[PDB]
Design a protein around this nucleic acid. Structure first.
Ligand SMILES: Nc1ncnc2c1ncn2[C@@H]1O[C@H](CSCC[C@H](N)C(=O)O)[C@@H](O)[C@H]1O
Ligand code: SF4
Length: 418
RNA sequence: AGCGAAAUCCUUGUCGGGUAAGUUCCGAC
């Protein structure tokens, strides 16, 4: 029942991998070249999961986890693995998936990197107390979070303050979550709440926000966003200042984001006469930097508020050579406006679900280079196949360490055709 | 419970394809 084991791989999701009786065995908390006693939790046909009883060897890449909630909070998977081991294992997963070796790692600071976080809240009726933190993996339980060394320093320092303020509210039984974003322009807080705030609660939140120099936003439902304090927010992408929608997507690691965008642009080698297409463009994180180089740029995005922020960004920065279209890129895309006109370069940066609907249309546009940014390598590999059967070839492949200590990886690929 | 869920965490199940007896991909109930 207690079984013996020697780990010789770290998957990209942060668990050690061993074999027992031929069967793959996934063990959280074990590093390559560690030996241990373990026992089996989930035992499927083709693989088993297991947890350590006695670790019997230490890897030289083993680290002492920095966060006291590591192992309970579900947010980090591999604080125990050196940054070097993480990058080596993530880029090995990416190479295998893409059948190509990884020609570069793009990285920034290993701690204090996260500029956008969503904390869950729950009132504990037993005690008089508000829970604020992140979920246990695979669970709805909240771990109370006192520190979080992956959060940007200005956000981590806000944690005891936000907890204190929110727990003094009358509406405290009725809070859904709190979003924290650290932009270049300043720090924003969005309180999602499921019943109205009395004017007393509001006064406390306004005072708290001014005290801490936060922009405060209230979301009483899915369709409303009340601005209580602050100016239009913005971040610096490649020396441009870009506004964004506070509840909606921006890249979560500022330092890696800068490096990604600048590298993407170098890879696309944008000529002053190039017509450029940027799919899944959000608020124009890549599109506007492309616009400073290209004759013409076309952005395509599904969320209305992100399309309109892209537009506002072009206007704000005096860029007249860029258009943004609101389309669902999983519908019949041949009937869509962007689909009917030529392009020299294509960049896409889709959600975890990837870009299955668009690959064939990208092929008919006949671009000379394609840069595909992905936060999910199994879907990149899936979509990539179609480019390769169409006679594109992988010219460069980068692993981007956007999410240190998690089991997630960013990547970017350059495809060029014959 | 409630919140969120074209998402760092934020969990239905069973079975199948793919895969490294490999979790991510894909499909059915
Ligand atoms: N079916 C779909 N149609 C159009 N847009 C979609 C889509 N599914 C996801 N998206 C968009 O794809 C984007 C991925 S996030 C990346 C956004 C932008 N490139 C940036 O760097 O900030 C999101 O903005 C999301 O709304
Ligand atoms: S997400 Fe934050 S609180 Fe959770 S384990 Fe990671 S550093 Fe700790």
């Amino acid at each position: 029942q207690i079984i013996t084991v020697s780990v010789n791989d770290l998957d990209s999701f942060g668990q050690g991998v061993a074999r027992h009786n031929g069967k793959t065995l996934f063990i959280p908390g074990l590093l390559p070249q560690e030996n241990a006693e373990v026992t089996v939790t989930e035992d499927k046909k083709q693989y088993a999961r297991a947890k350590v009883v006695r670790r019997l060897s230490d890897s030289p890449e083993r680290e002492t986890p920095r966060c006291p909630h590591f192992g309970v909070c579900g947010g980090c998977q591999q604080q125990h693995a050196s940054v070097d081991l993480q990058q080596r294992s993530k880029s090995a997963a990416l190479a295998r998936l893409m059948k190509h070796d990884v020609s570069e790692v793009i990285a920034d600071v290993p701690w204090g990197y996260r500029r956008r976080a969503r904390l869950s809240l729950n009132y504990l009726p037993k005690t008089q107390q508000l829970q604020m933190g992140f979920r246990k993996a695979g669970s709805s339980d909240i771990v109370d979070v006192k520190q979080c060394p992956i959060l940007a320093p200005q956000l981590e320092a806000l944690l005891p303050k936000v907890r204190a303020c929110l727990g003094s509210l009358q509406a405290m039984r009725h809070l859904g979550h709190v979003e924290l974003v650290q932009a270049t322009s300043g720090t924003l807080m969005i309180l999602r709440h499921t019943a109205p705030l009395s004017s007393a609660d509001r006064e406390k939140l306004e005072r708290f926000s001014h005290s801490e120099g936060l922009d405060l936003y209230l979301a009483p439902d899915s369709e409303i966003l009340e601005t209580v304090s602050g100016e239009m927010p913005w971040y610096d992408s490649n020396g441009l200042r870009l506004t964004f929608s506070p509840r909606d997507f921006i890249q979560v690691n500022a330092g890696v984001n800068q490096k990604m965008v600048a590298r993407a642009l170098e890879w696309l080698d944008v000529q002053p006469e190039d017509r450029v297409l940027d799919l899944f463009c959000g608020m124009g994180n890549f599109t506007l930097p492309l616009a400073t180089q290209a004759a013409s740029v076309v952005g395509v995005e599904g969320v209305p508020a992100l399309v309109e922020k892209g537009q506002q960004n072009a206007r704000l920065n005096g860029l007249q050579n860029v258009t943004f279209y609101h389309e669902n890129l999983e519908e019949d895309v041949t009937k869509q406006p962007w689909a009917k006109n030529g392009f020299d370069k294509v960049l896409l940066d889709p959600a975890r679900a990837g870009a299955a609907g668009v690959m064939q249309q990208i092929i008919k546009l006949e671009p000379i280079r394609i840069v595909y940014v992905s936060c999910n390598p199994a879907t990149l590999a899936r979509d990539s196949e179609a480019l390769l059967k169409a006679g594109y070839t992988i010219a460069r492949l980068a692993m981007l360490d956007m999410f240190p200590h998690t089991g997630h990886l960013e990547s970017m690929v350059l495809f060029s055709r014959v």
